[PDB]
Design a protein around this ligand. Structure first.
Ligand SMILES: OC[C@H]1O[C@H](O[C@H]2[C@@H](O)[C@H](O)[C@@H](CO)O[C@@H]2O)[C@@H](O)[C@@H](O)[C@@H]1O
Ligand SMILES: [Ca+2]
Length: 217
């Protein structure tokens, strides 16, 4: 897996961008091209930065489930979380060399995790429009109106001390939003929801020369 060594000032946590998703659209959220990149074909609704608590939960009254609703429940950002796509980007800093098992405990309605330079995004280009890779580490999809898969896991081998691009794209098509995010470290340590000290951001520096490490090994 391709990693990076950005030399700018490090920022804490991951950037989160918000994009429109059509209420009750039961097709788009499950299109692989949409989850990978097409979500950015609309104007960004806005963004927040510095996020370390990655897990998503929005709920509302069952009497309202066929309807849009304004709330700040997603990352403090005022939107309609009943119907929205979220892109989280940053860099993962492995404390140790080994296999890392990322997990989505379940999902509602869809989410992907991509890991690696030229997979999640290009090294030193975190803030750019999305690249087109559908080589997902995790691809979770809730069937329309039925139970979502659980313990949806994916492994990446990482070398200590390099920064690995990560991208989570998440969509809610209606009603409840759910995405519990965790990772199991090579020592068996579980990191649940709060990724402080494991995820960082760097401002784009497309001039930096030695940013990409094709083979960290
Ligand atoms: O019983 C259907 C469904 O209800 C709830 O999920 C809702 C919503 O969040 C989903 O996006 C859509 C489409 O799958 O279904 C519901 O409106 C949850 O109770 C869920 O567990 C369940 O399958
Ligand atoms: Ca939903």
């Amino acid at each position: 897996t391709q990693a990076c060594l950005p030399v700018g000032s490090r920022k804490n946590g991951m950037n989160v961008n918000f994009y429109k998703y059509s209420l009750q659209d039961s097709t788009t959220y499950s299109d692989p091209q949409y989850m990978a990149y097409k979500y950015s074909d609309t104007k960004k609704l806005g963004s927040v930065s510095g996020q370390t608590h990655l897990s998503i939960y929005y709920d509302l009254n069952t009497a309202f489930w066929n309807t849009a609703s304004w709330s700040s429940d997603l990352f403090g950002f005022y939107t309609t979380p009943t119907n929205v796509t979220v892109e989280m980007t940053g860099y993962f800093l492995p404390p140790q060399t080994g296999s890392y098992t990322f997990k989505f405990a379940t999902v509602d309605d869809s989410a992907i995790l991509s890991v690696g330079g030229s997979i999640a995004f290009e090294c030193c280009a975190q803030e750019q429009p999305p690249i087109t890779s559908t080589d997902f580490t995790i691809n979770g999809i809730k069937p329309w109106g039925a139970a979502a898969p659980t313990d949806i896991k994916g492994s990446t081998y990482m070398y200590a001390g390099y920064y690995y691009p990560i991208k989570i794209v998440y969509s809610n098509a209606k009603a409840l939003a759910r995405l519990p995010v965790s990772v199991v470290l090579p020592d068996g340590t579980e990191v649940n929801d709060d990724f402080e000290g494991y995820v960082y951001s760097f401002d784009d520096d497309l001039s930096q020369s030695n940013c990409t490490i094709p083979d960290p090994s």
